[PDB]
Symmetry: D3
Subunit: 230 residues, 6 copies
Amino acid sequence: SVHIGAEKGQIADTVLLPGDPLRAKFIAETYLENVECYNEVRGMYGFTGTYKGKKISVQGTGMGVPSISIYVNELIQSYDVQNLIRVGSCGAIRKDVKVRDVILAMTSSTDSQMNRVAFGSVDFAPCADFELLKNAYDAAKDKGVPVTVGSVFTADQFYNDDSQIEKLAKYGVLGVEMETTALYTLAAKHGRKALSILTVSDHVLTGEETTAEERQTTFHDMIDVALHSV
Amino acid sequence: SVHIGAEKGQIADTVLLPGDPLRAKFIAETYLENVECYNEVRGMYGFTGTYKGKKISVQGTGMGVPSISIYVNELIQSYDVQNLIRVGSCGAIRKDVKVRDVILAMTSSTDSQMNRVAFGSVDFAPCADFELLKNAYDAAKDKGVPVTVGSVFTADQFYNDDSQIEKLAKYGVLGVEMETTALYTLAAKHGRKALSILTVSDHVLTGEETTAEERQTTFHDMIDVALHSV
Amino acid sequence: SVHIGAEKGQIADTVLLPGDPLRAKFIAETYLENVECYNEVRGMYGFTGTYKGKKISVQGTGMGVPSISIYVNELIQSYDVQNLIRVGSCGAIRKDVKVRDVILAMTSSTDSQMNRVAFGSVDFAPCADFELLKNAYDAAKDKGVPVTVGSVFTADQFYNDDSQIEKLAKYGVLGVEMETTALYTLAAKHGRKALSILTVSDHVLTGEETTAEERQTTFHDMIDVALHSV
Amino acid sequence: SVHIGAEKGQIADTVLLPGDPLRAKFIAETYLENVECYNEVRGMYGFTGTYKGKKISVQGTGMGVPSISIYVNELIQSYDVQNLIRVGSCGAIRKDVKVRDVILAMTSSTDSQMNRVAFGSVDFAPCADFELLKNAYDAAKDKGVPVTVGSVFTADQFYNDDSQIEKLAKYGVLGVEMETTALYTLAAKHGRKALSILTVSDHVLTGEETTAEERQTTFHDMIDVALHSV
Amino acid sequence: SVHIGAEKGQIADTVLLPGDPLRAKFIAETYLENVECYNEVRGMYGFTGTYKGKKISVQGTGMGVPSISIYVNELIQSYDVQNLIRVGSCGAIRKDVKVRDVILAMTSSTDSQMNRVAFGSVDFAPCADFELLKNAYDAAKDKGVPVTVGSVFTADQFYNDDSQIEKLAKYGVLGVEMETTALYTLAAKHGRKALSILTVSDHVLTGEETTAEERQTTFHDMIDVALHSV
Amino acid sequence: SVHIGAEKGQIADTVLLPGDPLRAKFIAETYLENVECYNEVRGMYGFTGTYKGKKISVQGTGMGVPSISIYVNELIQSYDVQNLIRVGSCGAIRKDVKVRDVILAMTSSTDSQMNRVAFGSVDFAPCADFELLKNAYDAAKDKGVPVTVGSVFTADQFYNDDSQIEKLAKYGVLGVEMETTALYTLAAKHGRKALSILTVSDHVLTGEETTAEERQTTFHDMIDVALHSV
Ligand SMILES: Nc1ncnc2[nH]cnc12
Ligand SMILES: Nc1ncnc2[nH]cnc12
Ligand SMILES: Nc1ncnc2[nH]cnc12
Ligand SMILES: Nc1ncnc2[nH]cnc12
Ligand SMILES: Nc1ncnc2[nH]cnc12
Ligand SMILES: Nc1ncnc2[nH]cnc12
């Protein structure tokens, strides 16, 4: 495939998808054994390692719907990947989402036009694979890792001068990020399993940041949920 | 309220929502003790009874997004209803959806403009309350009731001449019905808990029918799952 | 047909369509001779009687576009019905529409998505059958029954927090109701004759109600116009 | 006003509106006594004359929604015109529309965004003034002029390569022209009376032409109906 | 063709398109030698003359997208025309566009629905032929005629009570007119060369007019650029 | 700023914008003297160097409208960047687009909702700064670099299953890429200068590839044109 330079059989059945290729590197190194680098095209790193005797791959996706779609389409069409777990951050848009909460997205709203192009008059609602969702949940509960399940918003512009997040928060939407709708749509289109697991990097509505130490801890919990759930 | 003839106290915090009021009569008389009919307005029957120490109301909602929105809005705003569970039928659009499986809807797609009117350029994805969904799933598993968790399509036209169902099935959508998007959207906006539990009444994309016997079996499984949920 | 339990030849050529199955009963009883009940599916009653030697049928339709579409499609496809006259109420949105005015809808605007799904880039304008419209008019004039002819709005949500009726009233629109656009569209699609005859139940913009005695009188005039015009 | 060179008093309360200004010259000189030309700006000719004791103006409007909107807006706002009657040609899209029948447009569909820009999520259905329509119908019947009352489609493209006319004919739409939606919308908003009277200049969906002789006959019937209307 | 009464070989390869048939006459007379009138249908004049040994034609187009489309389609389909140069006026919407500036439109935005009908989910951007644009530019520079290159807005309603020109001016849009998007779209669709050359008739945002003497001078510069560039 | 790790002074007023950061490294090291890397955040590399007496920065932007919008917004708002030139690849969609021609984009079509979200009912046509475009064209001509000036399509999906490219080619669109609309829109809104220069990396509508040798030749022509432009 064009944006991925792996050989046949270099990419595992299960894949973690951070947005940042440097986090992909960071995860692969810290949690995986016997790591090889299978992709360097565009500096968008993909690694394959073992975690307790199972092969996992970790591939940066880039930022935004178009960018993740490319990687996901190529991981599905060219490398036959089965499970795709986005591991990422989001901006919380409601006061009741807390900085240590790991978020499991059941679904995502979006102002991306991707699905409108596909389905004209239908509001298409992307859906997580329940089996993946359930296993992530059960592994968080098993540990006492605090988890919230609900919906996110896949924004097409990071900076927004029309930003309608205020209305979305009234309807229960937990947070805003940029990839989830693409993952869930293309996964389901191809009969594959996807889930997004997200931590809070900020509170969008007040402007409040979360401290570097809090982020490090939730990032650990997130990768641990994704790995244990596999 | 305009369409519900109940007096203060008569309607439970928890309400089951079939489309068919005759089915509401049936549900009420079969599974609940100490039943009163609190509404006759428009023949759209609603009953309250007891089930294992808890108040339950059962309210026919009619067919289509506009009809159930009227009933849900009134139940929420005038009767401070907290938990809303739609129990009904739907058309399977995929071969691997079997006639025995009870469906729990995580989310719903729609070609209803209800949400495009409220949101503008956003594709809003309505979402189930995870807690109701998890309790319903756990109670299905407790009894070994067969369950499938995924997404549905909420149509405005039973008879859809330009039908896009062929494409929705390709995106993993399980089934078609006519109420779920409105239920989930309105519940969410008012911070209340909603879930839709559905049975297969036929296969849309082959035409074939389900026997009177499959139908009432799966209808039984569906009501027990809902009641045992709460 | 699925939602209608009539036998072949139980439904007449001309049909009155109130929204409320209990009004269908009320009309059938009060104005018709030799009444039989041909439908009880969903408690959505349909009766057939004679009025001055002509067979008429009267069938509740439910509330909202999806609900009326089902009945209308089945009355047209399965029972070969020729004339369909909706008899109903609407909320007046302009001061110059008076409580005793019987309304003949020539056309209807709508925020329903039904026609947008059908016709993508066209604003489709549903149209009443002139012959029916003319005969209703002539029968009101013959009696001195006061009539106003113009357009209505077919709303998809009864309660509206985006409600754009204020702009519609500036453009001459007389009132708001929930079924007319579906009737007129499907009738015309199938080469059949439809008309909606409406009375004012309220003034939406001020909040003013109309007294029970006024409603009883206009309801009589409405059914009388529909019957005499047949 | 920008596009009309008339001085106070010169333009009648009642105005006929052909698209072709040469046809406006023809109408003016043939049917009216005591004619003055009040506008030459853009060659878009407009005349005033007398007909049986009444002032009539006759104004070419050009072709398309934007052109006639300019003229209608100015006529309404600057010259306090009360009654606006478009008289023109259109393409028949249905076999049962005959070349002799004069068309009275109750309403018009459009693929013009004029109304989607003003309304948002609403499909606005422009409507004729019933009184003008009824007077025109009564004057056709008085002379036995053949008349058909229904709806038209107002196109933005005479030559429409992705044409949806095939579907519009299936919904009972009689004909295609290029001005009516704008006329009815603008009249309605300013509380003035508008009607469109059209003749068939060919059949769009067979290609065939109407003879020079049919054309001028039906053109005569059309002008007499309009003039005898007021 | 229907709206044009020219004979085979009466219309030249290069055509100037003013909106006003009386300006077409004015241009033909003043700048062309050996002028003949080839079209009088609808008083929409087209003339053919010579300018320094080359045949040019000059054809009024009318006002608005639908009107220009008709002429352009017929000039392309029926008369094989190769180059089409709109010569017109526009309302400036930014302070930095000056009254003596000749405007070369590289592109145009529009609220016309024409391209949305054609291309559903694509924002289509019409484009000028660079060769024509370059030659117009070079001929203005050669003379010291002051020129600005950028984008315009093709409005569908001259008078606008929703008018969104304020936002367009923030995005660099220079002016508003009514034809350009149609020309550029149909030209390019048919493999032909189009360019619009515009002068400022007014400042829309303040209300300031430009004097009659200034307009006469810029109109000269505009025709001179169009002719020299040919 | 969030995604760029530069300190005050490090980023030039003029910035080249490849999609591929490895290509940004390549461009920086090959053509510029005195290079520092000012950003490593997300591996999305950005460098500053000198070229013939002028500061140039070279910044990878990633793939897709959302990714380049983040980078352009930050460059504009935090680093007061004045001139923004995208240099990259695109897919040719027309036979007469040859693999040697460098493309200068006058404008871009899009199926991105970015602009429909900001504008509503308007089709916004993003436009290049003519001065940058003219300087780039003049520098191509100075060296005889083959150049084609026209319009591109900015897609949200590299892999577009319902693809409308067949129609866009019929309207004279040259090529497909994934960034240009965002670049031109954002530059324009902030009153800065933007241009996109593209090379052909394959023909989309035949499938065929361009040799490694054509590719690097045309890549050379593209960078010289951009650098010699400023
Ligand atoms: N504030 C934000 N907006 C959009 N996407 C984000 N991802 C993480 N934080 C975000
Ligand atoms: N076939 C069908 N279409 C729409 N709604 C349905 N509910 C059950 N079956 C259905
Ligand atoms: N107020 C109202 N709104 C919508 N539909 C109605 N039908 C009758 N009254 C109505
Ligand atoms: N064929 C046609 N298409 C559009 N408008 C018309 N007016 C008359 N005939 C027409
Ligand atoms: N003010 C204006 N609005 C729209 N189009 C125009 N053409 C010239 N002036 C104009
Ligand atoms: N074929 C293609 N599709 C989309 N973007 C591209 N960029 C280069 N080639 C492309």
